[PDB]
């Protein structure tokens, strides 16, 4: 369970798939502006190992830290594709959706 990687679980958006078995993921965190006391998104890039090359640019993925980095910049592995780009499944109902509209009604399977 121990790891030398600082970020153990992070969610991000895939922004690149040009590296073999590696997805480039933009992770955003909220950071407090000390003067304005307003939160602004601060984005950081993480390389994630994607053995099956199943990540598509734009999908939301969950990354898990590796025990030790496998490369200079690869410290995480693809743990789960949360929201496949253009193929989102509503977690609350389990039905496919296109934006704020259902593609299959939850009433179909009762």
């Amino acid at each position: 369970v121990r790891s030398s990687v600082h970020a153990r679980w992070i969610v991000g958006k895939v922004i690149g798939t040009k590296m073999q078995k590696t997805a480039k993921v933009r992770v955003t965190r909220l950071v407090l502006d000390p003067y304005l006391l307003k939160y602004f998104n601060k984005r950081k890039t993480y390389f994630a190992h994607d053995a099956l090359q199943q990540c598509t640019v734009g999908d939301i993925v969950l990354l898990r830290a590796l025990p030790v980095p496998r490369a200079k910049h690869v410290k995480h592995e693809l743990a789960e594709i949360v929201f496949k780009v253009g193929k989102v499944i509503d977690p609350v109902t389990g039905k496919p959706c296109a934006g704020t509209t259902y593609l299959e009604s939850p009433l179909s399977s009762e």
Partner: protein, 39 residues
């Protein structure tokens, strides 16, 4: 400006204070070259 603009610009950067004829020093030693009068 908007909050996004204020955040993006950051705190105001005020130019480093200029140094006068003494170069930021209370006194300086000098050697007199010539004396004269000014109007």
């Amino acid at each position: 400006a908007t909050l996004n603009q204020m955040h993006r610009l950051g705190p105001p950067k005020r130019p480093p204070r200029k140094l006068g004829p003494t170069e930021g020093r209370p006194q300086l030693k000098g050697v007199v070259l010539c004396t004269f009068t000014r109007k």
